Amino acid sequence: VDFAFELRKAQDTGKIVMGARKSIQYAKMGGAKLIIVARNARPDIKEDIEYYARLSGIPVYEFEGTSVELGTLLGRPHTVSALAVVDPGESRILALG
């Protein structure tokens, strides 16, 4: 699965929500279809995300990259340490699950 491509595709054709806060929020509300977390997401933040996702049976795929690398992918001027896919759109981003 072409992560970078599929991520962008889901960005351009679906619904992704960025940030640890929002991802935990969509996890506990079960609104998220998948969560992506940066390899180096801050351990205390990463553990909570990973807990809420598990609580809700939501899949989590660890991006093998940094949060500055994930942020640059999403074309953001800032770090992204986790993201929740609400709508995959036309992409295969759920195949990461």
Numbering used by the authors: 1 to 97
Authors' own words:
Protein stability can be rationally improved by optimizing various types of interactions. One strategy is to optimize charge-charge interactions on the protein surface. The electrostatic contribution of an ionizable group to the Gibbs free energy of unfolding can be estimated from the differences between the pKa values in the folded and unfolded states of a protein. charge at 298 K and 333 K were similar, suggesting that the electrostatic contribution of the charged residues to the protein stability is insensitive to temperature changes.
Determination of the pKa values by NMR spectroscopy requires relatively high protein concentrations. In particular, it requires the protein samples to be soluble in a low ionic strength buffer. However, wild-type T. celer L30e crystallized readily in a low ionic strength buffer (e.g. 10 mM sodium citrate/phosphate buffer at pH 6.5) when the protein concentration was above 0.01 mM.
